[PDB]
Design an enzyme around this catalytic site. Structure first.
Site, PDB file in Angstrom:
ATOM      1  CD  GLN D  11       0.399  -0.812   3.166  1.00  0.00           C
ATOM      2  OE1 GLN D  11       0.980  -1.641   2.467  1.00  0.00           O
ATOM      3  NE2 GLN D  11       0.420  -0.863   4.492  1.00  0.00           N
ATOM      4  CD  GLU D  71      -2.082  -5.245   3.113  1.00  0.00           C
ATOM      5  OE1 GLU D  71      -1.710  -6.390   3.435  1.00  0.00           O
ATOM      6  OE2 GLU D  71      -1.289  -4.318   2.851  1.00  0.00           O
ATOM      7  N   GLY D 144       5.809  -5.815   5.155  1.00  0.00           N
ATOM      8  CA  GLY D 144       5.811  -7.256   5.011  1.00  0.00           C
ATOM      9  C   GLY D 144       5.509  -7.692   3.592  1.00  0.00           C
ATOM     10  CB  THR D 145       2.671  -7.182   1.339  1.00  0.00           C
ATOM     11  OG1 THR D 145       2.363  -7.587   0.001  1.00  0.00           O
ATOM     12  CG2 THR D 145       2.259  -5.735   1.515  1.00  0.00           C
ATOM     13  CB  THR D 179       5.958   2.863  11.416  1.00  0.00           C
ATOM     14  OG1 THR D 179       6.043   4.189  10.880  1.00  0.00           O
ATOM     15  CG2 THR D 179       4.490   2.490  11.566  1.00  0.00           C
ATOM     16  CG  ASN D 206       8.081   8.341   4.881  1.00  0.00           C
ATOM     17  OD1 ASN D 206       7.374   8.851   4.018  1.00  0.00           O
ATOM     18  ND2 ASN D 206       8.194   7.030   5.029  1.00  0.00           N
ATOM     19  CG  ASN D 228       2.324   9.338  -1.564  1.00  0.00           C
ATOM     20  OD1 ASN D 228       3.341   9.146  -0.898  1.00  0.00           O
ATOM     21  ND2 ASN D 228       1.137   8.862  -1.210  1.00  0.00           N
ATOM     22  CD  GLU D 254      21.120   6.924 -21.726  1.00  0.00           C
ATOM     23  OE1 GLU D 254      20.911   5.713 -21.948  1.00  0.00           O
ATOM     24  OE2 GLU D 254      20.865   7.824 -22.552  1.00  0.00           O
TER      25      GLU D 254
HETATM   26  N1  LIG Z   1       6.111   8.430   2.042  1.00  0.00           N
HETATM   27  C1  LIG Z   1       5.204   7.469   2.142  1.00  0.00           C
HETATM   28  N2  LIG Z   1       5.390   6.457   3.057  1.00  0.00           N
HETATM   29  C2  LIG Z   1       4.476   5.469   3.167  1.00  0.00           C
HETATM   30  C3  LIG Z   1       3.357   5.454   2.355  1.00  0.00           C
HETATM   31  N3  LIG Z   1       2.622   4.375   2.697  1.00  0.00           N
HETATM   32  C4  LIG Z   1       3.266   3.694   3.673  1.00  0.00           C
HETATM   33  N4  LIG Z   1       4.417   4.367   3.976  1.00  0.00           N
HETATM   34  C5  LIG Z   1       5.433   4.011   4.978  1.00  0.00           C
HETATM   35  O1  LIG Z   1       5.966   2.724   4.743  1.00  0.00           O
HETATM   36  C6  LIG Z   1       6.261   2.117   5.983  1.00  0.00           C
HETATM   37  C7  LIG Z   1       6.141   0.613   5.858  1.00  0.00           C
HETATM   38  O2  LIG Z   1       4.794   0.352   5.564  1.00  0.00           O
HETATM   39  P1  LIG Z   1       4.453  -0.769   4.473  1.00  0.00           P
HETATM   40  O3  LIG Z   1       5.645  -1.086   3.615  1.00  0.00           O
HETATM   41  O4  LIG Z   1       3.333  -0.245   3.612  1.00  0.00           O
HETATM   42  O5  LIG Z   1       3.993  -2.063   5.308  1.00  0.00           O
HETATM   43  P2  LIG Z   1       3.078  -3.129   4.536  1.00  0.00           P
HETATM   44  O6  LIG Z   1       3.319  -3.041   3.049  1.00  0.00           O
HETATM   45  O7  LIG Z   1       1.660  -2.845   4.942  1.00  0.00           O
HETATM   46  O8  LIG Z   1       3.447  -4.604   5.048  1.00  0.00           O
HETATM   47  P3  LIG Z   1       2.253  -5.493   5.662  1.00  0.00           P
HETATM   48  O9  LIG Z   1       1.737  -4.854   6.928  1.00  0.00           O
HETATM   49  O10 LIG Z   1       2.756  -6.876   5.978  1.00  0.00           O
HETATM   50  O11 LIG Z   1       1.140  -5.596   4.645  1.00  0.00           O
HETATM   51  C8  LIG Z   1       5.241   2.657   6.960  1.00  0.00           C
HETATM   52  O12 LIG Z   1       5.855   2.890   8.198  1.00  0.00           O
HETATM   53  C9  LIG Z   1       4.806   3.972   6.361  1.00  0.00           C
HETATM   54  O13 LIG Z   1       5.291   5.040   7.139  1.00  0.00           O
HETATM   55  C10 LIG Z   1       3.155   6.481   1.443  1.00  0.00           C
HETATM   56  O14 LIG Z   1       2.161   6.493   0.724  1.00  0.00           O
HETATM   57  N5  LIG Z   1       4.089   7.486   1.333  1.00  0.00           N
HETATM   58 MG   LIG Z   2       0.004  -3.503   4.095  1.00  0.00          MG
END
Ligand SMILES: Nc1nc2c(ncn2[C@@H]2O[C@H](COP(=O)(O)OP(=O)(O)OP(=O)(O)O)[C@@H](O)[C@H]2O)c(=O)[nH]1
Ligand SMILES: [Mg+2]
Ligand SMILES: Nc1nc2c(ncn2[C@@H]2O[C@H](COP(=O)(O)OP(=O)(O)OP(=O)(O)O)[C@@H](O)[C@H]2O)c(=O)[nH]1
Ligand SMILES: Nc1nc2c(ncn2[C@@H]2O[C@H](COP(=O)(O)OP(=O)(O)O)[C@@H](O)[C@H]2O)c(=O)[nH]1
Ligand SMILES: Nc1nc2c(ncn2[C@@H]2O[C@H](COP(=O)(O)OP(=O)(O)O)[C@@H](O)[C@H]2O)c(=O)[nH]1
Ligand SMILES: [Mg+2]
Lengths: 134, 47, 426, 436, 426, 437
Positions: D11, D71, D144-145, D179, D206, D228, D254
Site C-alpha cells: 500500500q 490485503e 511485510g508485503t 513505525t 519520510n 507522494n 545510461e
Molecule cells: N512516504 C510514504 N510512506 C508510506 C506510504 N505508505 C506507507 N508508507 C510508509 O511505509 C512504511 C512501511 O509500511 P508498508 O511497507 O506499507 O507495510 P506493509 O506493506 O503494509 O506490510 P504489511 O503490513 O505486511 O502488509 C510505513 O511505516 C509507512 O510510514 C506512502 O504512501 N508514502
Molecule cells: Mg500492508
C-alpha cells in the site's frame, strides 16, 4: 399495554450510554454530511417476500455487496465538500485547471507514420481519377 | 407487533402458560399471514 | 472481508457483548430490528467483517452467546438491541457453575462444549476466511473461567493458525465479590499462557477510577464500564473495517507486539475520555491525545506502569488528521520517557491511522500495550494462592467432582517461571 | 515506443502510485476516466503518452502498471474511486490475507501462490509493448508485503526477463523515526536478496520530506498526499527526457552505465531543488546557478546522510524546462571549486547532464509553485555506510537475546538466513569503505 | 405418461397417504371437490401421473386403499380432501387383524387379496405406460405387513419388470407401540428383500425429534409427522411431473443408488426445515440447504450415520438455480468428511435440479441415501427376535392359523445373511 | 449447397441445441417464427442460410437437424418454448421410460425399436441435401440415452451411409466433479464404439467451462445456458468457412486431412480465445497476437489437461472477423519461439490457418460482448490421453467388486463386454504413448 420488558430500575440508567434508533437532524448531523437512509417500511417484505435470483456477479447470495456492487461511494463525496477518506484528494480539483497545458514540446513520431503507407502499390499503377497535381 | 411480542418470549419453555401464550401468538400469526396472502394474491380485490 | 466470530462465556461475557453489539450497531448504524439505517455507504461496505447478512437488508450478528443458565439469555433479550441475536447460537445449560472451576470444565461444561463446537464450526465454515476468534469472559467466574477456558483449549486443536484475543476481566485487587476467586484465577492462568496469542486484561476497579477521575460521574453504573470497554473493543479492530492511511489488523498487532511465546500479556487504554464540565476548555488535537495515553491515570489494568518498563506498545488512530505531528509526539514520548522503555529494542510503538471516527466522537484513538507491570497483577493472586492453599481450605468443592490435588501444584508451579522470565527483562 | 513498466508493491506503492499516475494523466491531456479529448488525428500525431499509456482502438487508453497487494483494503477504494475507470480490473491484484509486517509471510507461505497471477499480467504487458526500457519498482523496505512479495518478485523476474533495467523507488526506514518494531528485520533480510537482483536503488526516507515540507514549502502538519506528489514529480522528471525533446536526451540505460561503478556500490540518492511555494517564489527569481547550489546542501536531500563525511562518486543532472546549456556549464563550473563538496580522487568528471524543454506541470491543490527550471540529481555517494552502520548496530542490539525469532522460524524459515544476512551487510560496509 | 399406482394397506399407511394426497393436491392445485384451480399451466402438463381424468373434468385419484377393518376409512372419507377418492376404490374386511401377520397373510388377507388384485389390475391397464408401484404401510401392524406385503408378492409375479419402492414405517428404537411388533416386522422384512427394488425406512421417534428440535413446534401430533413424511414422498417424484435442467425419475434414482441386488434400504431427509422464530435470521441458500442433509438430526431413520458409512447419496433440488455452487458444495462435503464415505467407488452423489419449488418456498431438496448405518436399524429388531423367540413366548398367536415352525428360523437366517452382507462394506 | 446435418441425441444434446440453434437463427436473419424478413436480405441468392436451413415455398426455413430423446421432458419443453414454430413436429423424436443412466438399455429390444424412426428421419432429411457435407453429433457419455442409443445410431449410420465424415461434440466426465455414479462404465463402453465409427472427437468438460467463466467473465450462476452459448460459439466458428467469404476457407475435408494423421488418433482439443465481458472489452485491446497468445495458456483449456507435459501434434487456426494475415504469420512465428510449447518431430509445420470475413454475432442478454476478432484452436495432442488413464483407473477401482453389474447383465447384454472394454483402451493409451515418443 401489550408487553413491556419492566423497563429498568433508575439505579441502572447512567449518564453516558444511550443509543436510540438515530433519526439525525436534517442534513447537518453527521461526519458524512447526509440525512440517513429511510429504510424498509415493514419487515414483512424482508421476511416473507424474497425473490429467488442469483444476481450474476456476487460469489454467494448472502454477500450482496461483495465487490462494492451497488455502493455508490465515488458519487457520494462529489456532493460534500471535504472527502471523508484520505484518498479522495487524489484527483479532486482537476475540473478546474490552474494552467492550460502546452502542446509544442512533445515526442511526435514522424518516421513511422509518413514513410509507411497502408497498401496500394501505386508506383506501377496509372494515376486514375481525381489526380490534380501542384 | 405480534412478531416483536414473539421474539421477546423465553429462550426455553417448561411451564404450561408459556406454551399456551406461544400457541396463541402462533395462531394470531397464521390469521394475519392468511389475510395478507389472500389480499396479495391478485391486483383487483372485490369487497 | 475478514470474518470475526464473537465467542462468549458467562454473565460477564453476555453483559459485555450486549453493548459490543450496541457500539458496533450504531457505528455501522443499524436499527434495533436489524435493518441498515446509516447515512453513508462507508458503513455498508464492511458489514461482513462482524455481521452475516440476509435478504431485505436484515443483518444478524455472528456471535456465540453461551452459558450454563437460561436466566441470563432472557436478560440479554431484554436489552435495547436484544432482538438481533439468533436463537440457534443460544446455547444454554441447566445447572449453574456457582463460581467454581471444576464443574465448568470437566463435569457440566465438558458435555456442553460438544454443541458449542458444533455451532462455531457451522459458523466458521460458513464464510470465506476467518481472521480469528474473539471472546469475552471472566477469569474470576465459574462458567467464564471454566467453560471459556475449555472452549479456548478445544478450538485451537482444529484451527491451529488463527489469532485469538481474550478480553478477560481479571479479578480486582481490592474488592473481591467471591472468596474462592484466586482458585479460578490461577486455574485459568495456567491455561491461557500455552494457548492464547494476545491477552487483554481489563480490571473493574481501574474502570471505576476512570469513571471517577476522568469522567467525574456521581453514580457509575455498569453500563459505563462496559461501554468504555466496548469502545476500546471497537477501537482495536477499527482498521479492518474502515480505510485509512496505514491499517493494522489483528495479525500485525501481535507480530509487532509479542517478542516471545510465553510473554503475551497486554493492557489497553482509550484516549478521548473527558468530563462534562471541562470539555469546552480544551482543544482536541494530536498533543492532548498523545499526552493522555502515557499517564497511569487512563489505564484499565490495576498495575502502575512506573514500576515496570514497556517492552513494546501499539497505537491505533481513528479519524482524519495529519500524521507528521503523530510521529513527532511518538518520538517525543520516546525521548522523555527513556527510563520507561527497555534499551535493547530500537523502536517500540506501532502507529496505525484509520480514517473514520466513532459516532459522537471525531478524533479517537486506542491504546494496546505490553508492560512489565502485569506480573504485579499476577504476584498478588500468587501470594493469595500460597497463603490460602497452605491451610488446605475449600478443597471439598474442588476434589469431590473428580479433580486431583496435583493440578493445584502445577498451577502454582507455572506462575513462578513466568514471573521470573518477566522479571528478567527489568 | 519507449515504454516502461511500473510495479507498485504494497500500500506504500499503491499510495505513491495514485499520485504518480495523477501526475501522469495530468501531464498529458488525459481525462480521469481515460479518454483523450484531443486524439492523435487532431493537432498532429503524438507519442509522448505511449511511454505510460496504451491507446486502444476506441480511445480509452489504459495504463501500463501493475498494483499488487495482499490485503485488498487499499485497492478497493481505488477500485471505487476517482480513477476507477482508468485501470484494467486485472491490473489490480488483490489477495485475501495480509503479510502483516513479516518477511516470512510474504515470501514463504502466501508469496508462492499469487505470484503466478502478477507474472501472467506482467508477461501480458510485456507482450503488449514493443519497445520496453526497464522496470520501475515501487515498494517499501520496512513492510511485510512490500519486502517479502517484492523480493520474491525480483528473484523471479531476474530469471525470466534476463538482463534488463531494475530501478528501485524504494522507501527507506529512518534513523530516528520508526513505525514498526519489526522494521530492522524486513529491511535487512531483503537486502540479502536485492544485492544481485537490482541495478539502481534510490532510497527515499519520510522525515526527510517532512523536513523539506516544514522548512522550504512552509506547510505545517502535511499529509501523505503532500509526499507522494513530490515522489511522482521525482519519478516523472526521471523519465522526462524519454518522452519529450531537448538538447540532450537521457534514456534509462545510461543511469546504470554512469552511476554504477561496481556491481555492489549501486545505491544512489535523489534530490529535487525547486520545491518552494507560491508565496516565497512569488517575487524572487529562480535561475539555474542557484538551483544547483541548493541541491548539494544537506538541508535539501531526501535521505538523512551528511556528505561532508562522504565522497561523491557519480551524479547525473536531469534538468528540465527553459534552460540553455551555457548556464549549466557555468553551474558545474561554480561547484567544482567548492572543497566542502569533495569528490573521490579516481573519478575526474563524475557528472552527467540532460536537458528537456518542458516546464513541470503543477497539480491543482499542490503547493509546488509554477517553476521554469527543474533539476533532478541522483547522487551516488559512499556516505550511505553511515546509514547502514546504525541499522546493523540495532540489529546486533536486539538479536543478542534472539528477540522475535520464534515467530520468524515457524513460517518457512530458519536461523541460517538470519545468521548469513549480517555477513552480507558487513561485506557491504567493507566494500563501501574500501572505495572511499 | 409414466404413471404411478399407489397402494395403501392398514390405517398407518392410509394416515400417511391422506396427507400425501393432501400435499400432492395442494401443489398440483386441484379442489377439495376435484377441480383444477391452479393459476399456472405447468401444473397441468403431466397431471396424469397422479390423477386420471373423469366425467365433468373431475381428476379422480388412481389409488388403491385396502384395510382389514372398516373403521379408518370413515376418517379419510371425512377429511378435508376425502371427497375426491373414487367410492369403489375402497375394499374393507369385516374382522380386522390387530397386530398379527397370520390373519393378514393366510386367513383373511388371503381371501381378500383377490379384490385388491382386481382393482390393481383394473387401474393398471387404464394408464398409458406404467412406471411402477408405490406402497405405504406399517411393518409393525397386522394388515399392513400382513396383507400389503402379499400385494408386493403378487404384483412381483404380475409385473416382474416395474420398480417397487416402499415407504416403510420401522419400529421406534426406545418406545414400542406393540409388544409383538418384532414378529410382524421381521416376518415381512425377510420377504421384502426379494420382491422389492427400493425401500425407505421411516421411524416416528426421529420424526418427533425433528418436529421438536428443528421446527420448534408446540405439540407435535401425527398430522405433522404425516406432513413431514409426505414432503419426502412428493419430493422423489419431482422431475416426472415438472421440467428442469437435470431430471431424475424413480428409475434413475435406483440405478444410481444401489450397486447390488439386496441392498436397497434407503434412509431419507428433507432440507428447508427452519424454526418459526428463526425464519428471519437465516436464508435458505445453497450452503444452508446442503449442510442440513449431512447433519444427523435431520434424518428420518433413527440411526446415526457417523457410526456407519454412506454408500451412495441423492439430492433432488427444485427452484431456479445453477450448478456451480451446488456441485462445488457437494464436492466440499464429499472431500471434507472423506472418512464418511467408502473409497472403492469414486463418486457417491446424484444431483437432480427442477425449476418449480413448492408453494411458500423457493429452494428445496430431498435426501435419499443408503448407508451401512441402516444395519443398526435391523440389529435391534434381530436381537429382539432372538431374545423373545428363544423363550417360545408369543408362538401360539401365529401357529393356530397354520404356520410352520422352522419358517421363523429361515426368516432369522435371511435376516442374519443381510447382516453379514451389509457389514463387509464398512 | 454446403448443407450440414446436425444430430442431437440425449437431453444434453437437446439442451445444447436449444442454444446453438438460437445462435444459428441470429447469425442469419431468421426469426423464431422462421421467416427471414425483407429488410435483412441482400436482394438475390444469399446462399448462406442453406447450410442449416432448408427452404419451403411458403417462405419458411426449417432447421436441418434432429432432436432425439427417450424422455419427453426436454423435447416437450422445446415444444412449448419460444421456438416451437421453427422446428417441424416430425423433426423431434420422443419416447417412454428413458434409458436411465445405463448402457444395458443400449442393445435391447426397447433400444432396437426406435433407431429405425430416427434413421428414417436422417434418410428423408439428407435426401433434400444436394451437397450434404457430414454429420455433427451432440451426445453425452455420462448419460444413458446419450451414450447407449447414440452408439447404435452411429453403428447403423456407419453401416448404411458408408465412409462418411462424423464429428462429435461430446460431453466428457469432469475430473473432480460428477453427476451420476454409473457414469464411468456408461462412458467406457461407449468409447469402445467411437473408435471404429468416428472421424474426430471434440470433448468438453463442464467444470472447465465453469472455471473459464469464473476466470474470464466474472460470472456466478453458470447454468447450462451459459455453457451451451459458448459451445454454440465454437460450433459456429468451426463451420464458419462453409457459410461466409474469407481469404482461406477450411472445408471439413481439409480439416480432417490436415488434423488426423492416423485413423486411431482422432481426438482434438478445443479453445475459444476472445472470452471477455462487456466491461473488460473497453480496456483490453484485442490485437491478433494478444488473442492468439491466450489459446496456448493451459488455464484457458476446454478439457482439463496440461499440454505442457504432453506434446502438440497438429493445429487448426480458425480466425474470424477482420484479420490481417501478416499478424497471424508474425504471431505464429513468435509462437514457435516458446520452449514451453513443444512439438513432435514428424510435424515440422504443424499449423493451418483459415480466414473468414464475417465477425462473430452476439445473442441479446448473453455473455460475450461485440467482438470482431476470434480464434478457434482445434489442437490435436497426445496430452488428451491422461483423461483415459484416469478413466481406466477409475473403472478398475470399481470392477473386481462386481459393482452395478446386475442391472447391466440382467438386462439384455453380456458381462463379457467389460473384458475387452479395458483391453482396447489399454491399446489406445499405448497408441497415444507410442506416437508421442
Ligand atoms: N512516504 C510514504 N510512506 C508510506 C506510504 N505508505 C506507507 N508508507 C510508509 O511505509 C512504511 C512501511 O509500511 P508498508 O511497507 O506499507 O507495510 P506493509 O506493506 O503494509 O506490510 P504489511 O503490513 O505486511 O502488509 C510505513 O511505516 C509507512 O510510514 C506512502 O504512501 N508514502
Ligand atoms: Mg500492508
Ligand atoms: N455442458 C453441458 N453439459 C450437460 C448439459 N446437459 C447435461 N450435461 C451433462 O451431461 C451428463 C449426462 O446427463 P443427461 O444428459 O441428463 O443424461 P442423458 O444423456 O440424457 O441420458 P438419460 O439420463 O438416460 O436420459 C450430465 O452429467 C451433465 O453433467 C448441458 O446442457 N450442457
Ligand atoms: N465490568 C463488568 N464486570 C462484571 C459485569 N458483570 C459481572 N462482573 C464482574 O464479574 C465478577 C464475577 O463474575 P461471575 O458473576 O462469577 O460470572 P459468572 O461465572 O458468569 O457467573 C464480579 O466480581 C463482577 O464484578 C459487567 O457487566 N461488567
Ligand atoms: N408416523 C405415523 N405412524 C403411524 C400413524 N398411524 C399409525 N402409525 C404407526 O403404525 C403402528 C401401528 O399400526 P397398526 O395399528 O398395528 O396397523 P394395523 O395392523 O393395520 O391396524 C404404530 O407403531 C405407529 O407408529 C401415523 O398417522 N403416522
Ligand atoms: Mg433422457
Amino acid at each position: 399495554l401489550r408487553g413491556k420488558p419492566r423497563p429498568l430500575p433508575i439505579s441502572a440508567l447512567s449518564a453516558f450510554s444511550y443509543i436510540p434508533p438515530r433519526r439525525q437532524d436534517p442534513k447537518e448531523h453527521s461526519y458524512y454530511y447526509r440525512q440517513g437512509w429511510t429504510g424498509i417500511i415493514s419487515l414483512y417484505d424482508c421476511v416473507f417476500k424474497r425473490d429467488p435470483g442469483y444476481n450474476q456477479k456476487l460469489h454467494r447470495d448472502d454477500r450482496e455487496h461483495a465487490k462494492s456492487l451497488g455502493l455508490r461511494i465515488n458519487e457520494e463525496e462529489c456532493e460534500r465538500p471535504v472527502g471523508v477518506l484520505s484518498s479522495s484528494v487524489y484527483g479532486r480539483r482537476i475540473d478546474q485547471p490552474v494552467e492550460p497545458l502546452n502542446r509544442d514540446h512533445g515526442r511526435a513520431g514522424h518516421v513511422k507514420a509518413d514513410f509507411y503507407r497502408k497498401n496500394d502499390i501505386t508506383s506501377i499503377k496509372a494515376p486514375g481519377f481525381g489526380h490534380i497535381s501542384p | 407487533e405480534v412478531h416483536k411480542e414473539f421474539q421477546s418470549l423465553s429462550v426455553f419453555i417448561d411451564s404450561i402458560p408459556k406454551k399456551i401464550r406461544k400457541q396463541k401468538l402462533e395462531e394470531e400469526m397464521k390469521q394475519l399471514e392468511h389475510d395478507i396472502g389472500v389480499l396479495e394474491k391478485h391486483k383487483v380485490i372485490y369487497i | 472481508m475478514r470474518e470475526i466470530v464473537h465467542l462468549q462465556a458467562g454473565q460477564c461475557g453476555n453483559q459485555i457483548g450486549a453493548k459490543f453489539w450496541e457500539v458496533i450497531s450504531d457505528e455501522h448504524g443499524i436499527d434495533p430490528t436489524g435493518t441498515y439505517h446509516g447515512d453513508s455507504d462507508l458503513q455498508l461496505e464492511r458489514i461482513n467483517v462482524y455481521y452475516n447478512e440476509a435478504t431485505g437488508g436484515k443483518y444478524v450478528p455472528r456471535a456465540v452467546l453461551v452459558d450454563l443458565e437460561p436466566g441470563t439469555m432472557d436478560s440479554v433479550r431484554s436489552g435495547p438491541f436484544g432482538q438481533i441475536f439468533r436463537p440457534d447460537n443460544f446455547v444454554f445449560g441447566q445447572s449453574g457453575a456457582g463460581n467454581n472451576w471444576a464443574k465448568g470444565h470437566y463435569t457440566e461444561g465438558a458435555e456442553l462444549v460438544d454443541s458449542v463446537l458444533d455451532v462455531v464450526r457451522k459458523e466458521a465454515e460458513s464464510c470465506d476466511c476467518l481472521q480469528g476468534f474473539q471472546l469475552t469472559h471472566s477469569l474470576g467466574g465459574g462458567t467464564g473461567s471454566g467453560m471459556g477456558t475449555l472452549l479456548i483449549s478445544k478450538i485451537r486443536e482444529e484451527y491451529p493458525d488463527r489469532i485469538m484475543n481474550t478480553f478477560s476481566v481479571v479479578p480486582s485487587p481490592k474488592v473481591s465479590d467471591t472468596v474462592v476467586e484466586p482458585y479460578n484465577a490461577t486455574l485459568s492462568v495456567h491455561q491461557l499462557v500455552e494457548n492464547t496469542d494476545e491477552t487483554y486484561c481489563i480490571d473493574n476497579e481501574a474502570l471505576y477510577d476512570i469513571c471517577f477521575r476522568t469522567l467525574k460521574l456521581t453514580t457509575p453504573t455498569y453500563g459505563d464500564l462496559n461501554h468504555l470497554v466496548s469502545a476500546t473493543m471497537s477501537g482495536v479492530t477499527t482498521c479492518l473495517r474502515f480505510p485509512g492511511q496505514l491499517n493494522a489488523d489483528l495479525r500485525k498487532l501481535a507480530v509487532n507486539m509479542v517478542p516471545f511465546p510465553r510473554l503475551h500479556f497486554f493492557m489497553p487504554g482509550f484516549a478521548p475520555l473527558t468530563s462534562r464540565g471541562s470539555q469546552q476548555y480544551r482543544a482536541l488535537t494530536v498533543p492532548e491525545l498523545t499526552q493522555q495515553m502515557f499517564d497511569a491515570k487512563n489505564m484499565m489494568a490495576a498495575c502502575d506502569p512506573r514500576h515496570g518498563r514497556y517492552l513494546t506498545v501499539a497505537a491505533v488512530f481513528r479519524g482524519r488528521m495529519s500524521m507528521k505531528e503523530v510521529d513527532e509526539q511518538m518520538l517525543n514520548v520516546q525521548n522523555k520517557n527513556s527510563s520507561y522503555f527497555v534499551e535493547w529494542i530500537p523502536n517500540n510503538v506501532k502507529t496505525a491511522v484509520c480514517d473514520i471516527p466513532p459516532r459522537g466522537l471525531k478524533m479517537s484513538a486506542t491504546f494496546i500495550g505490553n508492560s512489565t507491570a502485569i506480573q504485579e497483577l499476577f504476584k498478588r493472586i500468587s501470594e493469595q494462592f500460597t497463603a490460602m492453599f497452605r491451610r488446605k481450605a475449600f478443597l471439598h468443592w474442588y476434589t469431590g467432582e473428580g479433580m486431583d490435588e496435583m493440578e493445584f501444584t502445577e498451577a502454582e508451579s507455572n506462575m513462578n517461571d513466568l514471573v521470573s522470565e518477566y522479571q528478567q527483562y527489568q | 515506443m519507449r515504454e516502461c513498466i511500473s510495479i507498485h508493491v504494497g500500500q506504500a506503492g499503491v499510495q505513491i502510485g495514485n499520485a504518480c499516475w495523477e501526475l501522469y494523466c495530468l501531464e498529458h491531456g488525459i481525462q480521469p476516466d481515460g479518454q483523450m479529448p484531443s486524439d492523435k488525428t487532431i493537432g498532429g500525431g503524438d507519442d509522448s503518452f505511449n511511454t505510460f499509456f496504451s491507446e486502444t482502438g476506441a480511445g480509452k487508453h489504459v495504463p501500463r502498471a501493475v498494483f499488487v497487494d495482499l490485503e485488498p483494503t487499499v485497492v478497493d477504494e481505488v477500485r471505487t474511486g476517482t480513477y476507477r475507470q482508468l485501470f484494467h480490473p486485472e491490473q489490480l491484484i488483490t489477495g485475501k490475507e495480509d503479510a502483516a509486517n513479516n518477511y516470512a509471510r510474504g515470501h514463504y507461505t502466501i508469496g508462492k501462490e499469487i505470484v503466478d497471477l502478477v507474472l501472467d499480467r506482467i508477461r501480458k504487458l510485456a507482450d503488449l509493448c514493443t519497445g520496453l526500457q526497464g522496470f520501475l519498482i515501487f515498494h517499501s523496505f520496512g513492510g511485510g508485503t512490500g519486502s517479502g512479495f517484492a523480493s520474491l518478485l525480483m528473484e523471479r523476474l531476474s530469471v525470466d526477463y534476463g538482463k534488463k533495467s531494475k530501478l528501485e523507488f524504494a522507501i527507506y526506514p529512518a534513523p530516528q523515526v520508526s513505525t514498526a518494531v519489526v522494521e530492522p528485520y524486513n529491511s535487512i533480510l531483503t537486502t540479502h536478496t536485492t544485492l544481485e537482483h537490482s541495478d539502481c536503488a534510490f532510497m527515499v526516507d519520510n522525515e526527510a520530506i517532512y523536513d523539506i515540507c516544514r522548512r522550504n514549502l512552509d506547510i505545517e502538519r502535511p499529509t501523505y498526499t503532500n509526499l507522494n506528489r513530490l515522489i511522482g514529480q521525482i519519478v516523472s522528471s526521471i523519465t522526462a527526457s524519454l518522452r519529450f525533446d531537448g538538447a540532450l536526451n537521457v534514456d534509462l540505460t545510461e543511469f546504470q552505465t554512469n552511476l554504477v561503478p561496481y556491481p555492489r556500490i549501486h545505491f544512489p540518492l535523489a534530490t529535487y531543488a525547486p520545491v518552494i511555494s507560491a508565496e516565497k517564489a512569488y517575487h524572487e527569481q529562480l535561475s539555474v546557478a542557484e538551483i544547483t547550489n541548493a541541491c548539494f546542501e544537506p538541508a535539501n536531500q531526501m535521505v538523512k546522510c551528511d556528505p561532508r563525511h562522504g565522497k561523491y562518486m557519480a551524479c547525473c543532472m536531469l534538468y528540465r524546462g527553459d534552460v540553455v546549456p551555457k548556464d549549466v556549464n557555468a553551474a558545474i563550473a561554480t561547484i567544482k571549486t567548492k572543497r566542502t563538496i569533495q569528490f573521490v580522487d579516481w573519478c575526474p568528471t563524475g557528472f552527467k547532464v540532460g536537458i528537456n524543454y518542458q516546464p513541470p506541470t503543477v497539480v491543482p491543490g499542490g503547493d509546488l509553485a509554477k517553476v521554469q527550471r527543474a533539476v533532478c540529481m541522483l547522487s551516488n555517494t559512499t556516505a550511505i555506510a553511515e546509514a547502514w552502520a546504525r541499522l546493523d548496530h540495532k540489529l546486533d542490539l536486539m538479536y543478542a537475546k534472539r528477540a522475535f525469532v520464534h515467530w520468524y522460524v515457524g513460517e518457512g524459515m530458519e536461523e541460517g538466513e538470519f545468521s548469513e544476512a549480517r555477513e552480507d551487510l558487513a561485506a557491504l560496509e567493507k566494500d563501501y569503505e574500501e572505495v572511499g
